[PDB]
Amino acid sequence: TFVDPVHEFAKELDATNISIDKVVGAGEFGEVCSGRLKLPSKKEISVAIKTLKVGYTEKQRRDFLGEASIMGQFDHPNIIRLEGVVTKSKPVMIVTEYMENGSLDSFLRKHDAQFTVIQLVGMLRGIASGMKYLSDMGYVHRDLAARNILINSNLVCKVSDFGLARVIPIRWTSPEAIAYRKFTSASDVWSYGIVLWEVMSYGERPYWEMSNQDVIKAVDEGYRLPPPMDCPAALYQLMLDCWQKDRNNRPKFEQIVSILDKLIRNPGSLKIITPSNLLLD
Description:
Elements: E1 18-26, E2 31-38, E3 44-51, H1 58-71, E4 82-86, E5 93-97, H2 104-109, H3 117-136, E6 149-151, E7 157-159, H4 175-180, H5 185-200, H6 212-220, E8 223-224, H7 233-242, H8 253-265, E9 279-280
Antiparallel strand pairs: 1-2, 2-3, 3-5, 4-5, 6-7, 8-9
Protein name: Ephrin type-A receptor 3
Active site: 143
Binding site for ATP: 24-32, 50
């Protein structure tokens, strides 16, 4: 079980064991970079490193480290691993798993139509497995989107961004969560359906740049994102199932993992195949 919120769930790292190799850019609370971490066993690993800006407010420190408090509760191959934090010296740091290929949406946009369906399904299965664990822990992510999935050198996808985490992204949010803030694991399943569309579309933006009011209204009227080009029928059906109006009729994450595992085991099933216009369902 997830517990709503730092040293209970995060290791205090010795800054001597951290080196910075490359500065990436600016983040919400400070700089983002990458480097290396020396483990207590002397093993050296690549890591992502985020720093808290100089002259931070106490609220900024709380929100920054609050992410570590959440992330550190999870230990799963498809959830970004927290290596630890540095708080006893400044700048304060959060040190996480290095993911060479970055955010999934931007990665796929660089590779349009360049992966096999089975490769894409493997990515999707990883994401589903991480979400099955999160939901098992009673954590509703609320910000599940391809931009918040990171992908490593071997194409393994892992859930990231534990900032809207709980015990306003309209395009990824279920209708009931938009209507009256009804967030449940089934609203994360809705979001997963959107991620599924994002992946099969190679990082196209869900609902393109439709007015937010129209995204809300169209979805409520029963309109759904159209099948991505060359999308297997099984995967478009899975999207539609994730996007059921009645949240009780959406599959559970365990069921999504099982569905994808069957497709991986019977890749011929993906050969049955199912634009900027929404389809009424």
